[PDB]
Design a protein around this ligand. Structure first.
Ligand SMILES: Cc1noc(C)c1C[C@@H](C)C(=O)N(C)C
Ligand SMILES: [Zn+2]
Length: 140
């Protein structure tokens, strides 16, 4: 589990979005595994605006933050997980590391701020849903 809290937005994995998220929906994209809802209180996070390929991510199933190198966001085939069938996921970055289903929502961060959240795992990789192209998160 986990979210990004930027401005008056809450960014979550689409598959973990709550009824309250859907009732306060700003934007959602199944192909990216992302959903954004509106918040009453302002959040503590800053979104990275950059093309970094190194950062640190939180792994809940290890209680640890790991430094990783990761691929630029692309269209990637993802094998079946407990929460999605085998399918293409867009705007996905991969790194070598540990990820189980419950690790979804852990932040990946670089020197510029939050890059994305954990969205995929298995076979020794961790996949992250990018948010650095969602420039509208920084206003309004
Ligand atoms: C799909 C997809 N996933 O992440 C990105 C980025 C895209 C959309 C578009 C920018 C694209 O296809 N590129 C450059 C790979
Ligand atoms: Zn960066």
């Amino acid at each position: 589990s986990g979210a990004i809290y930027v401005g008056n937005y809450r960014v979550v994995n689409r598959h973990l979005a709550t009824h309250n998220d859907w009732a306060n929906l700003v934007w959602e994209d199944s192909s990216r595994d992302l959903l954004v809802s509106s918040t009453t209180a302002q959040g503590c996070d800053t979104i990275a605006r950059c093309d970094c390929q190194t950062g640190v991510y939180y792994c809940s199933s290890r209680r640890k933050h790991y430094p990783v190198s990761f691929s630029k966001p692309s269209l990637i085939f993802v094998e079946a997980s407990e929460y999605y069938p085998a399918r293409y996921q867009s705007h996905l970055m991969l790194a070598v590391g540990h990820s189980e289903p419950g690790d979804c929502g852990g932040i990946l961060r670089c020197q510029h701020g939050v890059v994305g959240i954990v969205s995929t795992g298995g076979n020794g990789l961790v996949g992250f849903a990018d948010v650095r192209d969602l420039l509208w998160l920084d206003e309004e």
